[PDB]
Write an enzyme that holds these catalytic residues in place. Structure first.
Site, PDB file in Angstrom:
ATOM      1  N   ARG C 152       0.817  -1.194   0.000  1.00  0.00           N
ATOM      2  CA  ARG C 152       0.000   0.000   0.000  1.00  0.00           C
ATOM      3  C   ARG C 152       0.859   1.256   0.000  1.00  0.00           C
ATOM      4  O   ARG C 152       1.779   1.386   0.823  1.00  0.00           O
ATOM      5  CB  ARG C 152      -0.913   0.030   1.220  1.00  0.00           C
ATOM      6  CG  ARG C 152      -1.887   1.189   1.126  1.00  0.00           C
ATOM      7  CD  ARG C 152      -2.612   1.387   2.425  1.00  0.00           C
ATOM      8  NE  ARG C 152      -1.798   2.081   3.407  1.00  0.00           N
ATOM      9  CZ  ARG C 152      -2.255   2.408   4.609  1.00  0.00           C
ATOM     10  NH1 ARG C 152      -3.508   2.082   4.929  1.00  0.00           N
ATOM     11  NH2 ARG C 152      -1.477   3.054   5.477  1.00  0.00           N
ATOM     12  N   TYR C 164      -3.738  10.794   5.690  1.00  0.00           N
ATOM     13  CA  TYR C 164      -3.754   9.438   6.241  1.00  0.00           C
ATOM     14  C   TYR C 164      -2.613   8.552   5.723  1.00  0.00           C
ATOM     15  O   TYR C 164      -2.298   8.549   4.534  1.00  0.00           O
ATOM     16  CB  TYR C 164      -5.076   8.691   6.014  1.00  0.00           C
ATOM     17  CG  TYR C 164      -4.839   7.243   6.348  1.00  0.00           C
ATOM     18  CD1 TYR C 164      -4.569   6.867   7.661  1.00  0.00           C
ATOM     19  CD2 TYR C 164      -4.776   6.265   5.354  1.00  0.00           C
ATOM     20  CE1 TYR C 164      -4.289   5.554   7.991  1.00  0.00           C
ATOM     21  CE2 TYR C 164      -4.490   4.944   5.678  1.00  0.00           C
ATOM     22  CZ  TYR C 164      -4.244   4.597   7.001  1.00  0.00           C
ATOM     23  OH  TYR C 164      -3.955   3.299   7.356  1.00  0.00           O
ATOM     24  N   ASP C 215      -5.332   3.621   0.009  1.00  0.00           N
ATOM     25  CA  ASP C 215      -6.442   3.764   0.938  1.00  0.00           C
ATOM     26  C   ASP C 215      -6.882   5.234   0.867  1.00  0.00           C
ATOM     27  O   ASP C 215      -6.126   6.136   1.232  1.00  0.00           O
ATOM     28  CB  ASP C 215      -5.980   3.347   2.357  1.00  0.00           C
ATOM     29  CG  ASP C 215      -7.108   3.289   3.389  1.00  0.00           C
ATOM     30  OD1 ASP C 215      -8.196   3.832   3.144  1.00  0.00           O
ATOM     31  OD2 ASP C 215      -6.896   2.693   4.478  1.00  0.00           O
ATOM     32  N   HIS C 217      -9.355   6.448   2.531  1.00  0.00           N
ATOM     33  CA  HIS C 217      -9.682   6.827   3.892  1.00  0.00           C
ATOM     34  C   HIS C 217     -10.920   7.730   4.059  1.00  0.00           C
ATOM     35  O   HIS C 217     -10.927   8.642   4.879  1.00  0.00           O
ATOM     36  CB  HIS C 217      -8.442   7.383   4.626  1.00  0.00           C
ATOM     37  CG  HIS C 217      -8.156   6.628   5.881  1.00  0.00           C
ATOM     38  ND1 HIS C 217      -8.785   6.908   7.075  1.00  0.00           N
ATOM     39  CD2 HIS C 217      -7.401   5.526   6.101  1.00  0.00           C
ATOM     40  CE1 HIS C 217      -8.398   6.036   7.990  1.00  0.00           C
ATOM     41  NE2 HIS C 217      -7.557   5.188   7.426  1.00  0.00           N
ATOM     42  N   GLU C 241      -9.312   1.727  -1.759  1.00  0.00           N
ATOM     43  CA  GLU C 241      -9.999   1.326  -0.534  1.00  0.00           C
ATOM     44  C   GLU C 241     -10.771   2.465   0.124  1.00  0.00           C
ATOM     45  O   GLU C 241     -10.301   3.599   0.142  1.00  0.00           O
ATOM     46  CB  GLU C 241      -8.927   0.809   0.443  1.00  0.00           C
ATOM     47  CG  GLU C 241      -9.365   0.720   1.889  1.00  0.00           C
ATOM     48  CD  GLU C 241      -8.234   0.240   2.796  1.00  0.00           C
ATOM     49  OE1 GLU C 241      -7.198  -0.256   2.289  1.00  0.00           O
ATOM     50  OE2 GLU C 241      -8.363   0.382   4.019  1.00  0.00           O
ATOM     51  N   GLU C 267     -13.325  -2.061   6.644  1.00  0.00           N
ATOM     52  CA  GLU C 267     -12.634  -2.336   7.907  1.00  0.00           C
ATOM     53  C   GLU C 267     -13.499  -1.959   9.117  1.00  0.00           C
ATOM     54  O   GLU C 267     -13.357  -2.566  10.178  1.00  0.00           O
ATOM     55  CB  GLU C 267     -11.276  -1.622   7.994  1.00  0.00           C
ATOM     56  CG  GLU C 267     -11.387  -0.102   8.112  1.00  0.00           C
ATOM     57  CD  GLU C 267     -10.098   0.616   7.758  1.00  0.00           C
ATOM     58  OE1 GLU C 267      -9.550   0.340   6.672  1.00  0.00           O
ATOM     59  OE2 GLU C 267      -9.630   1.472   8.554  1.00  0.00           O
ATOM     60  N   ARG C 288     -13.320  -5.749   3.464  1.00  0.00           N
ATOM     61  CA  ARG C 288     -12.270  -5.551   4.450  1.00  0.00           C
ATOM     62  C   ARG C 288     -12.681  -5.851   5.891  1.00  0.00           C
ATOM     63  O   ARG C 288     -11.873  -5.679   6.807  1.00  0.00           O
ATOM     64  CB  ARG C 288     -11.788  -4.101   4.399  1.00  0.00           C
ATOM     65  CG  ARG C 288     -11.411  -3.632   3.001  1.00  0.00           C
ATOM     66  CD  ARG C 288      -9.909  -3.594   2.815  1.00  0.00           C
ATOM     67  NE  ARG C 288      -9.254  -2.700   3.781  1.00  0.00           N
ATOM     68  CZ  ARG C 288      -8.169  -3.038   4.477  1.00  0.00           C
ATOM     69  NH1 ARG C 288      -7.643  -4.239   4.315  1.00  0.00           N
ATOM     70  NH2 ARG C 288      -7.603  -2.179   5.329  1.00  0.00           N
ATOM     71  N   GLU C 344      -4.083  -7.642   5.163  1.00  0.00           N
ATOM     72  CA  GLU C 344      -3.259  -6.526   5.596  1.00  0.00           C
ATOM     73  C   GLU C 344      -2.347  -6.972   6.727  1.00  0.00           C
ATOM     74  O   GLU C 344      -2.775  -7.712   7.609  1.00  0.00           O
ATOM     75  CB  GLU C 344      -4.129  -5.382   6.111  1.00  0.00           C
ATOM     76  CG  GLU C 344      -3.330  -4.152   6.561  1.00  0.00           C
ATOM     77  CD  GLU C 344      -4.247  -2.967   6.822  1.00  0.00           C
ATOM     78  OE1 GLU C 344      -5.457  -3.188   7.027  1.00  0.00           O
ATOM     79  OE2 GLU C 344      -3.775  -1.822   6.836  1.00  0.00           O
ATOM     80  N   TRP C 407     -11.867  11.219   8.952  1.00  0.00           N
ATOM     81  CA  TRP C 407     -10.448  10.911   9.061  1.00  0.00           C
ATOM     82  C   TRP C 407     -10.187   9.564   8.435  1.00  0.00           C
ATOM     83  O   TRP C 407     -10.960   8.625   8.619  1.00  0.00           O
ATOM     84  CB  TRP C 407      -9.941  10.966  10.509  1.00  0.00           C
ATOM     85  CG  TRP C 407      -8.513  10.591  10.559  1.00  0.00           C
ATOM     86  CD1 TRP C 407      -7.442  11.377  10.232  1.00  0.00           C
ATOM     87  CD2 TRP C 407      -7.989   9.303  10.875  1.00  0.00           C
ATOM     88  NE1 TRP C 407      -6.283  10.650  10.334  1.00  0.00           N
ATOM     89  CE2 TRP C 407      -6.593   9.374  10.734  1.00  0.00           C
ATOM     90  CE3 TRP C 407      -8.572   8.090  11.271  1.00  0.00           C
ATOM     91  CZ2 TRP C 407      -5.760   8.284  10.985  1.00  0.00           C
ATOM     92  CZ3 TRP C 407      -7.750   7.012  11.514  1.00  0.00           C
ATOM     93  CH2 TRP C 407      -6.357   7.114  11.366  1.00  0.00           C
TER      94      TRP C 407
HETATM   95 MG   LIG Z   1      -8.093   1.567   5.720  1.00  0.00          MG
END
Ligand SMILES: [Mg+2]
Ligand SMILES: [Cl-]
Ligand SMILES: [Cl-]
Ligand SMILES: [Cl-]
Ligand SMILES: [Cl-]
Ligand SMILES: [Cl-]
Ligand SMILES: [Cl-]
Ligand SMILES: [Cl-]
Ligand SMILES: [Cl-]
Ligand SMILES: [Cl-]
Ligand SMILES: [Cl-]
Ligand SMILES: [Mg+2]
Ligand SMILES: [Mg+2]
Ligand SMILES: [Mg+2]
Lengths: 407, 407, 407, 407
Positions: C152, C164, C215, C217, C241, C267, C288, C344, C407
């Site tokens: 990543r 991020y 990502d 984010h 992502e 996630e 995720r 991950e 965030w």
């Molecule tokens: Mg993430």
């Protein structure tokens, strides 16, 4: 510790006819631990025998018996031509036998590997049939007296020599009775008027607590099924089964639109693709697919988790043509699955029980898989050898004008 | 003039059990103006206590108390893991307390900030329960005599030791009664046959003017709910509530397809995402989400405006586990929202009323939030200290075979 | 044989901070066999501690430890308020610990109970971050040299103090770094122009064989994500992502409409209801969700089977805030799931590894769960006692004008 | 305390033309507290004057001024013929004036009643126009030098005498310039080829940080708008506005299908029904509806909450025909709404500012509503009397063959 490979050292197919035909797979691993799986495909039995003996088994020998999922994907994708009743029934035997082995190595009854017990036992239904409504109701009373909380009712249709579910057999129905297939004649209109009378009388005689079920056996169109469901609403059936041939899954949309009678389908399904639309559109309440004909414990579990997203419950098929090996597997599955609905139970003959000794048992309207390690079942090969295969076909059904129809 | 920042100088969580558990947040600003919010999450109370004390409150201290929306977005997005009953109930306490403060600074009862009064008071319903239909109807007559224009009826199901809504409590129902959770047994079939008899008798006894409601309490599948709604149509219920577990929002499509009985759901919802599909497809008539469990005044107002685009009205949950602080907030919301439907009202114990003194009051089938500045409510902390927390769980429910089910 | 009940005789929650906060559940059964589960909820840790200690654990004591599914349904339905990150993370700890116990009794590493191995190991990705593209690429070369087949990339955005994934930490990213939450500032427009340059340079420097991931984010709207995906197509990313906040699952329709860059999300999801629409509409390629935050092995397996019907593969989140206990569980899951995509892997500190000794290990771009019985992991409680909890929050993010953002 | 009724004792409509026509409502309550609202409907001004004076105001006198929502529903439903620009603009004046009053009684600037500040100020865009691309770019540089972070660009189309947005006015555009409507001629094909050149040159001259916007002004069909959006993608516009006449909301489906250029629409909308489909299908990124023409603060807030469920942000129209009273209201709304996108800002003449003194002000690409109680705005009635109404129409537009078209 090291990765342990328990190699498959042998696998064989045994055919026996202790009252009807059964096909069984027995896998032996390096340390002598064995597992069995049912591979019986009623009326096409020997096609699955060859599929296993001539094609699958030679690829199985020497494989790591622990790799259940991998073996499943290996045969499912590797056949190239994917799915179908023969291949998925052959694969079901492999899957059942490998899970038998896995639970034996774990020292546990199989349900303990599949999430543990979710209930104290597995509610079953039996089969009340009779030539007249009166005879059907008399048979249903006997099931009540036997502690059955759920009963399927099937009655002869006046003006028709025969119909599905009605025979001389009382504690079971054994249709594969022709050295060639028996031909039946059918009238939808006679049936549609009669079925509701059966359930009207049955509720009056049997009361409201007992669960009543009916199997339409593939004979209607969606709009006729919607009507039949509507006419049956006052009698609050547990389910109305196989109302229409289901290859076109959208066919259940019209039924669902016109009735609140609960719907069940899928004893003949061999994979999730036969019911994905039915389930995701909430077109049915019970899925009847089985570990035997839809690719084993591995695949039925996947399908059941999908079903649970859509208010669908399991209603596994349980006719005599699923051997005690399937029944054992089915019961471990039923005991451990959260979205359990009902389990069909037709009694096997005493000779079948002796050929396939098992730990599961019936009590007070419930079956329980028992606590033996594995499936809790085996085949007695010497006894099985005393009952040679005998060809027997399922019946067929035609309209009054000769048109080929659905049995 | 200058931007005025009214800093938050303190915030604390008080736990008390004046008859049942309540969790309260009290925020103090620089000039001594205080606000309170309810944070009670029945049966998981202390998880929200820690969520506030250990995580949220330290971020709250020193913030500008005027920035209600910003604080809301701060905690909603900033937790990273978004939503859920614990977080949204914790956030509801903050939001209620900040709006209390805002209205106090404005010198007005809160409803005046939320658009002003849209009605002269807030229609409520109470809870008639009894072990038999006769007892339930007797209880309903008492509510009529009390001026209640709407009454929820719940009766024991014959053949079942217990069911939701039926207890020794008459003016309220207080389920969280186990030092461990009480286990109940359930039969859908017994219930489906019985519920319509309850309402048949109730209409005959109580007449047609009174609004009658029923809470299914999560126990059916969509096709069963469609049937139950249909059987209840002749009795013209105000709503049929929580018919099916609603995580799959499409589940309400079948109900809506088969009945015109009005539908209500969502006391347990914590955000708009739990009901967006239900609302936008016009699958329900009343949303039961509350200021307590769906993220405060700020969020419920947003949801209610969305509901108003789709003929959905508010039907806020009002069980005893929502403290008088929630009730105050709920009433300011109900008085000022245009698409108001109905407000649930279970009476609190006298001790609870004394711990949480308030301006709202009941008269002639209606509550009114009162005209005090703010929410018109506070907590008496000294009295609250006399009633220490005592662990109590909501009941659970299982099928006749042991299967884990919905209470 | 008899049904064996292995009672739970004790259960406790241990909190430790060997470099960051971790919460652990340890269950002891009658014969001394123990199991552990991770319950860490980054930034809201103590809410889950109370959820377990104060509410769940007392219901757990004395239960049959074999009944994994039943316990799962018991806590999931029984909480009444359903799901949410706190409850599902608490439930995940229970589920992990019970499966640990089950595999220990079976004498097998857990993956053997979940279908056996489907692959020789679990492909992982690491985290290349840097303030500039050049620094990010330099970090990615190190991961290549370490045998990582997937990486990543995250780079600082010029004109923005922070973004991020970019910090002083190289082999991992440890965001929960504030005794109060760190505030960041954000510009979508600066980011959208920059991200594609990062991957343009990265492909040129790193070649085409390596898998590259990014990502987003949570920072874009669907139409911006569609554009970003389109601009990234020439660089053939493995996945893009968390492109947009996903509460409105239909938001991914626009992305899918405008780009073929593969999409990953979830996630933060705690149940199948957070992703059912994403999956059934084929709006994403990788899910995720994790065993830690979506309700354990039991639930993730169900979700993964659903995902497999729709071409969705697993891409489990693996940040340092998932303890080695989660990693062990995740690896048993990843090794045995057929539709595995990627795992991950952020390295834990040496102190964390010592507190949570484990059998899993890294080799040549892959992790493997190891062959110890159970999860192959435990907690050293004495060592854990040397590292007391220390409050730490995830950062927050605001727009250039102060608007609260993601965030 | 007692319910306080603050009666409306007077309400009047003042018409003035300090550079252009403005219509204002002023409401007086019992204690002398007054509120004002803008009722200006460009080009049909006096229809709204009569709607207020002759029909609405007599129903307003003697009402409780606190009942904002009730008054809103009273006029919205009570007119019987529902909605429309005249009625909703008339209703907007009432709503603005009542909220002015409410905030004055609360002692707060209005944004404090609407959730508090969500940002430090309100980002605006200005209007760069010129006959040629070069002139347009020269005008845009001046806006940059003025600190504007966002700029709308509009250029003459070669081969066409005139086009929208291009005039002798630099800091604003004042179209209602005919004692009868000015007729313009239009060619879509000339425009479609030219617009992308404008933005190509503009990015080259102005750089990438500045936000660039374009107003299509209703002149394309969906497939042409899809093409134009696609041709504009390399220049990353902030939004492309009013691409097609939007009565058929499904018309935006084709645009959304063919471009990722962000879309804005709706300055002319008068209610949520004009944009419900646009929003719920995620067909646009910014809603341009205003407090003036879509029914006040009360209604725009409701619409904005709905927009926030679908990734839609506010982009309120801000042309000179919205008086400083609208601007004040708009800014209180913009400061407090979470899903703020951008605010249009055309400067009023000095005479207009003097007739409508206000607290809001511009600084560094942002407006701020100021901290005065209420809207922070009033009308100087004596000065207003010095500028009598003067009839002025918006222009019209026809195709090259004379066909009536959209201006
Ligand atoms: Mg993430
Ligand atoms: Cl053989
Ligand atoms: Cl008969
Ligand atoms: Cl505290
Ligand atoms: Cl939660
Ligand atoms: Cl009764
Ligand atoms: Cl503990
Ligand atoms: Cl760079
Ligand atoms: Cl006037
Ligand atoms: Cl009009
Ligand atoms: Cl030009
Ligand atoms: Mg059948
Ligand atoms: Mg309820
Ligand atoms: Mg415009």
């Amino acid at each position: 510790y090291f990765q342990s490979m328990l190699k498959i050292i042998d696998a064989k197919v045994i055919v026996t006819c202790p009252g009807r035909n059964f096909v069984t797979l027995k896998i032996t691993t390096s340390d002598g631990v064995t597992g069995v799986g049912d591979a019986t495909l009623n009326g096409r039995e020997l096609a699955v025998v060859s599929y296993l003996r001539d094609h699958m088994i030679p690829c199985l020998i020497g494989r790591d018996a622990h790799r259940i999922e991998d073996v499943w994907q290996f045969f499912y994708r590797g056949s190239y031509w994917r799915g179908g009743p023969v291949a998925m029934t052959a694969l079901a035997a492999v899957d059942m036998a490998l899970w038998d082995i896995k639970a034996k190595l774990a020292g546990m009854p199989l349900y303990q590997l599949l999430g543990g017990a979710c209930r104290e036992g597995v509610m079953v239904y039996g089969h009340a049939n009779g030539e007249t409504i009166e005879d059907t109701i008399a048979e249903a009373r006997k099931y009540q007296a036997l502690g059955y909380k759920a009963i399927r009712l099937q009655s002869g249709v006046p003006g028709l020599p025969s119909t599905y579910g009605v025979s001389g057999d009382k504690m079971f129905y054994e249709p594969a009775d022709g050295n060639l297939p028996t031909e039946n004649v059918w009238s939808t209109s006679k049936y549609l008027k009669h079925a509701p009378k059966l359930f009207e009388a049955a509720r009056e005689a049997l009361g409201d607590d007992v669960h009543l079920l009916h199997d339409v056996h593939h004979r209607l169109t969606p709009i006729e099924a919607g009507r039949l469901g509507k006419d049956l609403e006052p009698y609050r059936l547990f389910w109305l089964e196989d109302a229409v041939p289901a290859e076109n899954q959208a066919g259940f949309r019209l039924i669902r639109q016109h009735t609140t009678t609960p719907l069940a389908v899928g004893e003949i399904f061999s994979h999730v693709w036969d019911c994905k639309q039915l389930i995701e559109e909430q077109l049915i309440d019970y899925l009847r697919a089985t570990v035997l004909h839809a690719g084993g414990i591995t695949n039925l579990r996947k399908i059941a988790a999908f079903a649970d997203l859509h208010h669908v419950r399991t209603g596994c098929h349980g006719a005599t043509d699923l051997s005690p090996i399937t029944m054992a597997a089915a019961l471990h599955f039923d005991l451990s699955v959260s979205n359990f609905g009902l389990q069909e139970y037709m009694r096997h003959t005493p000779e079948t029980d002796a050929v396939f000794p098992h730990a599961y048992s019936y009590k007070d309207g419930m079956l329980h898989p028992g606590e033996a390690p594995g499936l809790g079942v085996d085949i007695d090969e010497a006894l099985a050898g005393q009952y040679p295969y005998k060809r027997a076909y399922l019946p067929v059904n035609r309209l009054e004008d000769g048109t080929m129809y659905n049995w």
